[PDB]
Amino acid sequence: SMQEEDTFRELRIFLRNVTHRLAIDKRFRVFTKPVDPDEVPDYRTVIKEPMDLSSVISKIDLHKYLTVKDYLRDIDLICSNALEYNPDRDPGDRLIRHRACALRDTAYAIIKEELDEDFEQLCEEIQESR
């Protein structure tokens, strides 16, 4: 229905706003674009599903996300990719792990404060009807 298409349009507006707020935070710069294969040729052989905030904006606009749960699976993948590629005790690895955990926690805290639980349940029930 038109009303269901208006529901998904409101979901996309919400997700673009959360993603922009993460992308302007200086702590999260390393997560804003894909890894450059020139600078890091090893990356795409270790990490099997790369993800970054520019790719997330592209996916929102391609209508890939019909629920906040499916958006949060991609935020979780940005975080888990950084934890697995950078697992060592040295300061450069510990700094990116702390930033990855902060990106994940910040996204979940904005959604807890600003997403209505009944709006998410509506999106889940339209998705499940298709």
Could you list the residues that contact ligand RJ7 (CB under 6 A)?
A: 19-20, 23-24, 32-34, 53-55, 57-59
Helical residues (DSSP H) of the chain, grouped into ranges: 2-24, 43-46, 53-61, 68-85, 91-114, 117-129
Closest distance between ligand RJ7 and the C-beta of residue 89, in Å?
30
Name the minimum Å distance from CB 70 to ligand RJ7. 14
Instruction: Supply φ then ψ for residue 67, to 5 degrees.
Output: -145, 160
> CB of 106: closest distance to ligand RJ7 in angstroms?
14
Nearer Cβ to ligand RJ7, position 2 or 24? 24
Smallest gap from residue 7 Cβ to ligand RJ7 (A):
23
| Cα–Cα distance, 71 to 15 (Å, whole number) | 8
Residues contacting residue 127 through CB under 8 Å, at least 6 positions apart:
66, 67
Contact yes or no for 83/121 (Cβ under 8 A): no
